[PDB]
Amino acid sequence: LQDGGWSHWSPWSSCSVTCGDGVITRIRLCNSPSPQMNGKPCEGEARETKACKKDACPINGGWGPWSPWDICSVTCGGGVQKRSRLCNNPTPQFGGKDCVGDVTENQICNKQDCP
């Protein structure tokens, strides 16, 4: 009957994130020696963690909602109308990408002919 004993600690791993908060981790084994018949087990944590902090992860631009369509440029005979949006939802931050698309849309309106 031999009591367990811990190996030395493994090296610490790298930070689990390249941005934001995460942990570095290191482990050990009760192999030195392994507990024998009716031997005492190793005591304490077989692994440890720490805090690793990195700069904020990029926040990519989301589009906010479209504005209501503007009133047609004409009441009759084929006008145009316009609406628009912002890339603020969220705003690109910490190097995040720009929104992809048009800030503005146009379309025909009242295409029927006028009396």
Swiss-Prot record:
Q: Where in the cell is it found?
A: Secreted; Cell surface; Secreted, Extracellular space, Extracellular matrix; Endoplasmic reticulum
Q: Which residue pairs form cystines in this protein? A: 15-52, 19-57, 30-42, 72-109, 76-114, 87-99
Give a brief account of the tissues where this protein occurs.
Expressed by platelets (at protein level). Expressed by monocyte-derived immature and mature dendritic cells (at protein level).
Q: Which residues are glycosylated?
A: 6, 9, 18, 66, 75
TSP type-1 domain segment(s): 3-58, 60-115
Domain of life the protein comes from: Eukaryota
The record's family statement is: Belongs to the thrombospondin family.
- Self-association and partners: Homotrimer; disulfide-linked. Can bind to fibrinogen, fibronectin, laminin, type V collagen and integrins alpha-V/beta-1, alpha-V/beta-3 and alpha-IIb/beta-3. Binds heparin. Interacts (via the C-terminal domain) with CD47. Interacts (via the TSP type I repeats) with CD36; the interaction conveys an antiangiogenic effect. Interacts (via the TSP type I repeats) with HRG; the interaction blocks the antiangiogenic effect of THBS1 with CD36. Interacts with ATF6 (via lumenal domain).
Say what the protein does.
Answer: Adhesive glycoprotein that mediates cell-to-cell and cell-to-matrix interactions. Multifunctional, involved in inflammation, angiogenesis, wound healing, reactive oxygen species (ROS) signaling, nitrous oxide (NO) signaling, apoptosis, senescence, aging, cellular self-renewal, stemness, and cardiovascular and metabolic homeostasis. Negatively modulates dendritic cell activation and cytokine release, as part of an autocrine feedback loop, contributing to the resolution of inflammation and immune homeostasis. Ligand for receptor CD47.
Protein's UniProt name: Thrombospondin-1
Q: Which organism is it from?
A: Homo sapiens
Q: Which gene encodes it?
A: THBS1
